[PDB]
Amino acid sequence: KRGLPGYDPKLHLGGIPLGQRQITPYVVSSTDTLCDGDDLHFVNNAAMQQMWDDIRRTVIVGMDLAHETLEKRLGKEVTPETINHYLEVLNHAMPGAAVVQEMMVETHPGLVDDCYVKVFTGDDELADEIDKRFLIDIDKQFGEEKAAQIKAAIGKTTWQAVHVPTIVVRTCDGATTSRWTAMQIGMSFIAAYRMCAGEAAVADLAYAAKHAALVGMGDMLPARRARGPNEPGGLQFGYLADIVQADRVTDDK
Amino acid sequence: DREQLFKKALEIKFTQEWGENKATEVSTDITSKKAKYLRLGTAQSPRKREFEQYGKEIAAKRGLPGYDPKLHLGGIPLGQRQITPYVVSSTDTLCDGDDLHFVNNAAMQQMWDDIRRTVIVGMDLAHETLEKRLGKEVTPETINHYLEVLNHAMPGAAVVQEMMVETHPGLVDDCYVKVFTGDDELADEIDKRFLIDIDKQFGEEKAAQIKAAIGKTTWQAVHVPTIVVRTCDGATTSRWTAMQIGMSFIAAYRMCAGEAAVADLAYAAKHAALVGMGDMLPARRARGPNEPGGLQFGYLADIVQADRVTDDKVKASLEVVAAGAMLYDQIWLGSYMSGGVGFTQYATAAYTNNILDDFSYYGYEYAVDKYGGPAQAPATLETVKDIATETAIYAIEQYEYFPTLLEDQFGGSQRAAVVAAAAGIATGLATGNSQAGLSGWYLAQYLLKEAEGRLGFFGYDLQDQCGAANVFSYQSDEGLPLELRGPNYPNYAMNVGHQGEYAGIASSGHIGRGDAFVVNPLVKVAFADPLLNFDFTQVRKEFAKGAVREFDRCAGERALILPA
Amino acid sequence: AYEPQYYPGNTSVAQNRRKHMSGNVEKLREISDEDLTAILGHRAPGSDYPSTHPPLAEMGEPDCPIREIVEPTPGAAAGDRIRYVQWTDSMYNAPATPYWRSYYAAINHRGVDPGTLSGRQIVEARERDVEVYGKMSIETEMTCPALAGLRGATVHGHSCRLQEDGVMFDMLDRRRLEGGTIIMDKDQVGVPLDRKVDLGKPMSEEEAAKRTTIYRVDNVPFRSDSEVVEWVQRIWELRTRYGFQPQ
Amino acid sequence: SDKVDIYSDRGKLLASDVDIMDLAPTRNRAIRTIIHDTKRTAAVNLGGIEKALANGRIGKVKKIPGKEMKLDIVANAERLAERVKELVQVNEGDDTTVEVLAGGKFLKVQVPSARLESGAEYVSSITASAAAITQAIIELFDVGIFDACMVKAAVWGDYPQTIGLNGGNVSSILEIPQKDEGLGFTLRNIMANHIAAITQRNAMNAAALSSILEQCGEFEMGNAIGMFERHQLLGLAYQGLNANNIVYETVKEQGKSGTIGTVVHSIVERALEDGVISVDKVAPSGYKFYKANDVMLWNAYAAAGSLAATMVNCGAARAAQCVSSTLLYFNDLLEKETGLPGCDYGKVQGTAVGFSFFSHSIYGGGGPGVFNGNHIVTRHSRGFAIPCVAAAVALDAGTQMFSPEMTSAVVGTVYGSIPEFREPIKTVAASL
Amino acid sequence: SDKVDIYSDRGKLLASDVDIMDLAPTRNRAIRTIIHDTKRTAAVNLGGIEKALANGRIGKVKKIPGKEMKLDIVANAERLAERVKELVQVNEGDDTTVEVLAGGKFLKVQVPSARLESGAEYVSSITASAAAITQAIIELFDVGIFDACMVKAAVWGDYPQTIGLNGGNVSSILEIPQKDEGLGFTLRNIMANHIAAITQRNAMNAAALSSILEQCGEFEMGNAIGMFERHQLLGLAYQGLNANNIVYETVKEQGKSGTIGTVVHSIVERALEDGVISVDKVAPSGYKFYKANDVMLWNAYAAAGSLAATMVNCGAARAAQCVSSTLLYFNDLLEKETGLPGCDYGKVQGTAVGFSFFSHSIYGGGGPGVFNGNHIVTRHSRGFAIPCVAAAVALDAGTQMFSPEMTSAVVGTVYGSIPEFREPIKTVAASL
Ligand code: F43
Ligand SMILES: C[C@@H](OP(=O)(O)O)[C@H](NC(=O)CCCCCCS)C(=O)O
Ligand SMILES: C[C@@H](OP(=O)(O)O)[C@H](NC(=O)CCCCCCS)C(=O)O
Ligand SMILES: O=S(=O)(O)CCS
Ligand SMILES: [K+]
């Protein structure tokens, strides 16, 4: 097709192709799946690419400082009703859809249906008032002892588990995620609380989402292997252990 | 009387029905200041109805809602004003503005991937290493064998070890390496399948200029797989390239597969003979090489190839503006540095409805008549003041003669980018000096502010108010020729409606002079290649193909490894 | 002594720009204090201005020589919250232009935070101070109630074609021409009010053309005000030269 | 030669007939001592170390279960300060200092000059302090081999997985060198909130300390060579050090009823009276185009005016946010009033345009307090914008969420305890 | 208290009964002067500026057609040096120096102490020099407003689009602070090729200058506090400064027929004779497990041994590449011979494992000359690996593509012209 060659097994050194020794498959441990080693190359395995994209496209952003800005700086009341309305607006806006301006052009929802935001809180009274569609229920997901340990560590604080579109981090990079997240959090607070769409208090919400209440997957790397946040090099080993969830559903240590 | 080039597009997008917007009932006169507001909302737009329908399916499937037009502020959906299409400039394609959003346009994503996945790596130092350390002879025969090996290995296939597992060629068929050289004797012996022939791709004068700049040196134009840069990042490219160059030298020259001389080839490929698309960015907007922020404006001008195939100087400069407005405002500022709905129309203002074309042809034609021709006007502040004022005031008045033009480019930043790009490009083409063009851009910005009593968005003119003083400054972080400026030049690091237009201005002085390239002849030759997925000779035509979901050279999909 | 000159030019547009800058603007309509509070949407009409409630660690007034010689505005002295007044002005000869609403505020009002954009212009200030500004912004010739509108969000319209009735489009329909007068029955962020606020008659096309601070090729072309074009070129040239060498 | 009289934060004469060359970062003894102490002083948060140990916490959200250690750090602050001094000092009786502050919660550590003289940067203030407190705690509480890594994490945070001591308890008025945008930006990467806290919210001293640090940064950047030395020193003297009392007297004259615009008119009147500007030509309408008789001195008057306008406008509202619009409209209106370029030939106005945007939008930035001379939004002017931001932050009366009391408690207590930092105008004039 | 006798590069006594505390970067006057001159000295490549101007070129491949300005620079080096001195100096008669080198192609610029005292880092050596030469050329050729940007590009390169002066013509022995991996790495980011070129390929002086800079780096990192000060100073004295002539005499004894292994045996014999190690216990086979009577002194003998083995092995082949394997197998065999940990408790051997890999594979690195204390491959040891790399590079007779003659012509000429850099052992001993 190209008039320029590519893969050719005979270009292996000496014109001798791979497989002079028996080519054998692999059993993926704990499964009955038998596959070629090439089927486990990250390029040829969509589950592997999607695992990295789900990490890359995620940040966690606190709500408490944003709610405090609304109450103290603007004298606005924050209730379960305003939070629930904010979450509906946020799940419409986060994938790339408009909420304030006229004549906006938007992302095709069919290309960004993996994008959404859920919330969790260590405040049980607030957990019982949040719209169940958006809640990660700590008591349901973890055993009684583990749920208590999580709540004691988190305290009475509320957080947004944000997952920006996979197509965005694939076109761009992991350092896009916290910025993409903050832009649509900002738009959703403006629309849901009927703020001025661009006043001084909006910059406090931006600083909270991008910096003061941001919990990304990893920080930047130094000049020789320069990369911004949310790249594999910045992912601490304990973060990967906390991303994986097998310990939550099996007692086999 | 000169017929404005945008009138045909305004007639089509405003007075002819698009979807079910009842355009003939809104207004049939493109000069009328009044329009009948029908407030049709979502019903008028097949595109917004497609999004609404997918939003219902998504909410139902996940049990967690998504797109809903009624979640717009006040429960009032988009389209209270008539929703109109855009004509992609220089084409007959009419599309919705949503079809030009980078997320919804595969041609735009593929343009960025083709840049991101490219580096240029010299061969001379590698060949010298083989001669000095191993006493190996390098000939056209050994080079041609090396290039066959390299095109098998580069996509992710093995050449030395036993029991290697490899990338599926069907997922990486966009990956290949071509070569070019300023050594005509060597060029005539390279296997034609891999050669970028400078004499065939460029005219006699431009080919001679490229060869004189390159000298008798040889280079590899490497394009790593799109799937790799999408899974990973731009900083992967030079490393991926060096790994497979190293393997190919080992196998093709029968070196020891891992001896001290191999490290010299690695240092040559990764650092000493590497020519990437851009360097890293500082901590606040940290990124490694080959990201849009590191792409100098002159590099984008050399990546674009319209000037290589058309003698229309304005057209060639505006193909650079289209590539830059899309890459720098939509992908870079609108996603890497922000995100969400983003900045589609801040960029489309510079590549739709033949508006920037009208203003730029007007200014350039004025300058050709007055000063004689391209690159004949003196490079002085008197010339800049003349051309930029004439072009800017003409452009300012068009928004007033045509209320539909003003409604199309509804944001002041859109008007500022287009008015100033025309003034800068006309000035650059006329003087053959892109720095003169940049000075003209800032004068046009100041004229527009006093004319309309407004300029752009809240922070639009940080760089424009800094601008006039920093064009010719020689102070540490102020002075720099425009060709070497880029999205990391301090004043330019944050705001829409400037970067892509600056890429056009950077190109303008060089296009005016008939130069083969702007800042890097190696980049110019590397992208003068029809095998690249994106056609860099026709940027706007490619964006139009992507808009109507007809771009058929999108790389990196995983359909082959997903269920049917 | 020094007599301010404000801005160059000799056309009606330049004269109107100096009127807005100097505050020499005619009063054309009246708005009651409660109707102004209702349309701004910051608090219930007739209610007292709420105060800020900063943490204990920020309550202390510091020993500062500047605080001792700069008198607080009434709003700052009372500790009012920072609130805003945001306007959108048609490019079809609305009397106001965004930069000139900001110059009016910067010259004539103390303790203000003006912001200029193409489709919106804002002033943030201590609430009672922003209401004093807001009253002048709406009662004077700086506003036509049809060609301009208070919009704290969804501002689109400055550059749109006018409606058939001459009113500038508003996606949220906060104000409209209802039976011979402009009625605003939603606050500046689109929340319906429990009242109708009468902003009076629109300006005629001729009055708007005579009172506007915007240049237009079909009214007072920018090209025709030679001193303004000269002033731009002079600032551009001197900024260019001094950026190279400040001498 | 250029001479000035230096006036105090209260408009009183401190020094007469001062050559501006003697106020330069490269010649003035007080400025050199301020920079020396900026580089050698670091803060150890003992209260933070105690909480990090007791809860097995690293920074704001990381927590490793099972690593808790209940050590009485704050109650042993004096004992630990003595050991930290022994470890940080090079020789007995050298210039090392360790002072316990905030009831045992912090240590102000000043490393000896010898550590800076044998190092390339300031970072030994952080590394010697962090290593010293880590070792002192391990010794005092006899921490075993398995648990010392938790003391290490409580002090140094995520380092070396992170480039710096992210989530640690050792900090400085300065940030790590890797955060510099370019060459010579270390002294520019200091939050305006830090300056206002250090100077006790005295707006004149806040502008002075910021102007000193910004101009030390401009000198280190290479922006004060040749004719540009005079250019930057005139700005330092007139904007930063109240030369000829122009800033203070303009603010006093305009303090009761003045606005951004009346400050513009006052500055034009003064520049004309002092012979800095003159009428160039009169247009047919009567508008007077002015010429600058001394361009650099006109720039300095516009820098002084930009600060005086900030004090009048932010002072009247007692609200920091007004600084972004004040810097924009003082210079925009100055150009429209005279036909001459504004401060820094459009770069103060340009900085103010982006600064206004990034202090009122969704895209980034924040309140005025988070900005600094190394911030991408506010770096563009040659040191003439951040001194106004520092004064504006000082003048705020409870409008900000991210106030100096929230972001700068440690730096404010530690560096604010040093007189040269608290009273920079007085210190500079006295060292002549 | 620890005492040593310092011996020269030729094995001659220079100083007796020296307390190792007096050799510390924080106390030794010669080391403090070396660091002071490292920070204040920069190189201006006038030859590079000339070619860049004449061809409109920026760096190795960028070229802007139509910008050629064929200015005569090199032949005017003395006139330009005089003007650069006027611009770089702070006061007449201060400690600024400007010297023309390499027949006009280079200027050695030493900025006055005042620029470092009012700056946070060393970067004013680059910025003052770059601004000075840019201004001097604009003046000498009366360069107009439109063309000055090309003089700027010829000197500063792509800056500020790039973080540093990428493709420019002003450089230092140091790299920009943004390239540091962590805190205290600036003095560690110096190519081994630079050290070997500066010291004129004298292997002892190459190891000494590298050891001084590496240990200044370890001190700035916070790795020489408390008990670790003695640890690093013993390594500096025995490996870097030929303490008690152990390095020189081991190399002399093993120079004719010695190998990596015979150097291991010599070091074990010497450590046992000097009482540094003793038999701990004897296994049933007769194998003797040794104990370290002084762990830090044993570490220092293993550091001296690592260097002596490099000199014997790389010296015999006259080939730098042998250093990576020498550092690995000297320490691996030392552990197998004694049952005691090797130099830096496995970190010299570990550094050597990755260094061998990254000097013989496709993945990165290069020849020994490109490595440095800040390089991710070779940073791991606490300053005990790069001094051996510098000696190995010096001993190479022509096997390398990326030799000091290719990568370090500017730095080698500029800093090599300074005696303290050329002869560091002699200079350090003489300052006692
Ligand atoms: C909330 C802000 C403040 C802010 O920080 N960003 C906003 C909003 C943001 C959102 C709007 C998305 C939404 O509707 O939900 C996005 C798309 C960025 C994002 N988060 O994806 C955007 N602007 Ni804005 N923004 C734009 C513009 C503008 C123009 C619109 C004026 C008019 O008359 O319509 C004005 C600035 C100005 O006056 O100059 C403007 C303001 C504003 N812009 C005001 C909202 C104005 C309002 O209340 O209606 N943008 C433009 O001027 C054209 C391009 C357009 C951008 C989308 C695109 O490029 O397609 C969008 C760029
Ligand atoms: C200012 C800075 O943000 P912070 O103040 O660091 O949060 C920066 N953003 C930007 O410059 C946003 C640019 C794109 C959106 C605005 C287009 S006008 C960034 O994220 O690094
Ligand atoms: C050493 C360094 O390379 P350079 O010496 O800087 O070229 C670095 N590579 C790596 O560390 C390669 C790691 C992956 C391949 C080896 C796996 S054992 C990098 O590219 O930044
Ligand atoms: O309104 S703002 O100018 O802040 C942002 C426009 S996208
Ligand atoms: K990617």
Residue numbers in the entry:
A (entry chain D): 65 to 317
B (entry chain A): 5 to 568
C (entry chain C): 2 to 248
D (entry chain B), E (entry chain E): 2 to 433
Which sentences did the original study use to describe this structure?
MCR is a three-subunit complex harboring the cofactor F430, a nickel-containing corrinoid that gives its yellow color to the enzyme. The chemical reaction catalyzed by the cofactor is a thiyl-radical mechanism in which the Ni(I)-active state will attack the thiol group of the methyl-S-CoM forcing the generation of methane and the formation of the heterodisulfide made of the HS-CoM and Coenzyme B (CoB-SH). In this report, we investigated MCR natively isolated from Methermicoccus shengliensis.
The asymmetric unit contains two dimers with the typical (αβγ)2 organization. Interestingly, while the first dimer shows an excellent fit in the electron density (average B-factor = 22.6 Å2), the second dimer has a very high average B-factor (51.3 Å2), which made its accurate modelling challenging. The UV/Visible spectra is typical of the Ni(II) red1-silent state with an absorption peak at 424 nm. Both coenzymes are bound at very high occupancy with a distance of 6.2 Å separating their sulphur groups as previously seen in other Ni(II) red1-silent structures, the density between the thiol groups was interpreted as a water molecule. Surprisingly, the S-methylcysteine and didehydroaspartate found in the close relatives M. barkeri and Methanosarcina acetivorans are not detected in M. shengliensis. Methanobacteriales, Methanococcales, Methanopyrus kandleri, and Methanoculleus thermophilus contain a 2(S)-methylglutamine close to the F430. This modification is not present in MbMCR and in M. acetivorans and the presented structural data shows a classic glutamine at this position in MsMCR. The electrostatic charge repartition of MsMCR fits very well with the one from MbMCR rather than the two other thermophiles showing that thermophilic and high salt adaptations of M. shengliensis have not drastically modified the enzyme surface.
